[PDB]
């Protein structure tokens, strides 16, 4: 994250403030999601599953979010991606 220098006799001491993750949990993951016969891939997150539903979260911090159109991008069909699972994709325009 950041470091703070410190004066020392004939030397220097750096206070390296680093980010260390902890308290990890296991989740089921999938490389892509197939809803409208089309493959979906997360822009920056990662597909995870807690056993009941599928969510998108960060690759460095657990933050489950609904799989929406703004979080994924379509590229190709589903039968090419190996290990793709079937799950619905949310669309913010549909409620309005």
């Amino acid at each position: 994250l950041m470091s703070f220098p410190q004066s020392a006799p004939h030397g220097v001491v750096f206070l390296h403030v680093t980010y260390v993750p902890a308290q990890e949990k296991n989740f089921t993951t999938a490389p892509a999601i197939c809803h409208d016969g089309k493959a979906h891939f997360p822009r920056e997150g990662v597909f995870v599953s807690n056993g009941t539903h599928w969510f998108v979260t960060q690759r460095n911090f657990y933050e489950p979010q609904i799989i929406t159109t703004d979080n994924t991008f379509v590229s190709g069909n589903c039968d090419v991606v190996i290990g793709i699972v079937n799950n619905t994709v949310y669309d913010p325009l549909q409620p309005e």
Binding site: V20, A22, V80
Partner: protein, 97 residues
């Protein structure tokens, strides 16, 4: 004549074990084991993260994982072929010794 060579602290077996642990951590956790606790992750997802890091979308990997694995296996084979073809690969270590 007094010239005595001392053996290193870490033997070849310990160096091999360290290398195998590094390799296992790399293939099972990516870069998470180096920053902190090891986090299991499928290797295709690790390759997708690497491609996103080099500026390539992960769909290119999810559509050509087979070809990429074939090219990786061929490169690994060619590495051993080059190592067995000529001893000039370890010329630096040979010159040091």
């Amino acid at each position: 004549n007094g010239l005595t060579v001392l053996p290193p602290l870490l033997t070849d077996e310990m160096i091999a074990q360290y290398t195998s642990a590094l390799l296992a951590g790399t293939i099972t956790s990516g870069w998470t084991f180096g920053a902190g606790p090891a986090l299991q992750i499928p290797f295709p997802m690790q390759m997708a993260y690497r491609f996103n890091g080099i500026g390539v979308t992960q769909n290119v990997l999810y559509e050509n994982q087979k070809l990429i694995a074939n090219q990786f296996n061929s490169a690994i084979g060619k590495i051993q072929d080059s190592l067995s073809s000529t001893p000039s690969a370890l010329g630096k270590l040979q010159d040091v010794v």
